[PDB]
């Protein structure tokens, strides 16, 4: 097709949710929320990545929401725009 995910293997929300097994205890956003917004854990710090656009987000702050940070930084992502 005319779009292609940066990480097909994380195409699945369940696969994204599993990536948070070792999400650090200081990281306040939930795996549930992050996986739902297309994001999976890269294994480094609190850094996640979008399966679709491949954008990465880290150093989350209080009051941050996963979808609004995803859309703010990567507004042309097909997952963002398909929501």
């Amino acid at each position: 097709g005319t779009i292609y995910p940066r990480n097909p293997a994380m195409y699945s929300e369940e696969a994204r949710l599993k990536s948070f097994q070792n999400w650090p205890d200081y990281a306040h956003l939930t795996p549930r929320e992050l996986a739902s917004a297309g994001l999976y854990y890269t294994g480094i710090g609190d850094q996640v990545q979008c399966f679709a656009c491949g954008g990465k987000l880290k150093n989350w702050e209080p009051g941050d929401r996963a979808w609004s940070e995803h859309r703010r930084h990567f507004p042309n992502c097909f997952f963002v725009l398909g929501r």
Binding site: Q47, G55, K58, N59, E61
Partner: peptide
């Protein structure tokens, strides 16, 4: 967050 910051774009990494």
């Amino acid at each position: 967050a910051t774009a990494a």
